[PDB]
Scaffold this active site. Structure first.
Site, PDB file in Angstrom:
ATOM      1  N   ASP A 113      -6.840  16.408  -1.297  1.00  0.00           N
ATOM      2  CA  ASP A 113      -5.429  16.239  -0.950  1.00  0.00           C
ATOM      3  C   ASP A 113      -5.285  15.452   0.348  1.00  0.00           C
ATOM      4  OD1 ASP A 113      -2.673  16.444  -0.531  1.00  0.00           O
ATOM      5  OD2 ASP A 113      -2.668  18.604  -0.136  1.00  0.00           O
ATOM      6  N   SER A 126       5.227   0.084   2.807  1.00  0.00           N
ATOM      7  CA  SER A 126       5.187  -0.870   1.724  1.00  0.00           C
ATOM      8  C   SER A 126       6.179  -1.993   1.991  1.00  0.00           C
ATOM      9  CB  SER A 126       5.498  -0.171   0.388  1.00  0.00           C
ATOM     10  OG  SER A 126       5.702  -1.115  -0.643  1.00  0.00           O
TER      11      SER A 126
END
Length: 330
Positions: A35, A199
């Protein structure tokens, strides 16, 4: 040193991935959910409330000659979806794909929430975010990656998740045969303890790319792709019959639909998520309404590049003094 281990979807929907981990002496092998959005290594154990264990493999520290109780230490964690666990702490030897850390904090669960009890395939979590998020008290503990870093050939690990198929976590090296073209690196902020990056925008199907900064985290421990409501609306508008359902808890679509791809930007590079990756199947057994793999982050408070996005890429988690993230097509 290096390590390399195969990671396997737990079910037909790729809801999560498990990776075998050796703990203790002699080895006890548990299948953990790696994770990159949390920083605790915790396991089902001999100490877990019996009613809360349902098919999982447990860690038994009394059977490990290298296990030492970390006196006074406890832990308690809550995840983005409301799941939780808590317990006490041992240190022990932990190996992943041939890579060994001695004195790793192994957090032993005394309590787990129902969602963990229900996932018989997940024996615990191995956190790979920054150690600043580790919940051990009163002395915070380091992640497996943090402990191994100094010894690794290169201070990196990589995630190569499969679509309906096995994949690979590598520690300490970049497998140049595992991706196509080049790896594009992008800046990371560690200020929230996550692999947080920006992004450069998105496209839907064959549509034109929209340049727009989208701050989010690279999180292998989250199933879906969670993005701003504007982006998610633009995506599902291209699917006939798709709608946001409050009763179901997100965007649903007719199972008869063919989904468009979704592209996200990494600097000047582009990663394309095939439409099939965005299909998470009937909302209930037998239903013709299907759950979408792209969902709104509104009310989460952060955008999450979860497995839906990451499995479309070869992802480098670069833990140099100044961490960075790399993405390549594959």
């Amino acid at each position: 040193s290096t390590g390399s281990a195969t990671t396997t979807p737990i079910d037909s929907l790729d809801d999560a991935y498990i990776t075998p981990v050796q703990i203790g002496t002699p080895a006890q092998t548990l299948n953990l959910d790696f994770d990159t959005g949390s920083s605790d290594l915790w396991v089902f154990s001999s100490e877990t409330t019996a009613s809360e264990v349902d098919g999982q493999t447990i860690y038994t520290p009394s059977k490990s000659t290298t296990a030492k109780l970390l006196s006074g230490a406890t832990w308690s964690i809550s995840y983005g979806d409301g799941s939780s666990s808590s317990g006490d702490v041992y240190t022990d030897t932990v190996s992943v794909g041939g890579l060994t850390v001695t004195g790793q904090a192994v957090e032993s669960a005394k309590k787990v929430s129902s969602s963990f009890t229900e996932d018989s395939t997940i024996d615990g979590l191995l956190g790979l975010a920054f150690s600043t998020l580790n919940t051990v008290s009163p002395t915070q503990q380091k992640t497996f990656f943090d402990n191994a870093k100094a010894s690794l050939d290169s201070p990196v690990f990589t995630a190569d998740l499969g679509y309906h198929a096995p994949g690979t976590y590598n520690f300490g090296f970049i497998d140049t045969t595992a991706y196509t073209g080049s790896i594009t690196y992008t800046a990371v902020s560690t200020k929230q303890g996550f692999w947080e990056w920006t992004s450069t925008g998105y496209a839907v199907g064959s549509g034109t790319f929209k340049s727009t900064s989208i701050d989010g985290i690279a999180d292998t421990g989250t199933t879906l792709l969670y993005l701003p409501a504007t982006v998610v609306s633009a995506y599902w508008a291209q699917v006939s019959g798709a709608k946001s359902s409050s009763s179901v808890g997100g965007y649903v679509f007719p199972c008869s639909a063919t989904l468009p791809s979704f592209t996200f930007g990494v600097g000047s590079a582009r990663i394309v998520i095939p439409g099939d990756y965005i299909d998470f199947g009937p909302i209930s057994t037998g239903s013709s309404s299907c759950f979408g793999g792209i969902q709104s982050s509104a009310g989460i408070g952060i955008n999450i590049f979860g497995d839906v996005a990451l499995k479309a890429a070869f992802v480098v988690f670069n833990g140099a003094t100044t961490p960075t993230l790399g993405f390549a097509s594959k």
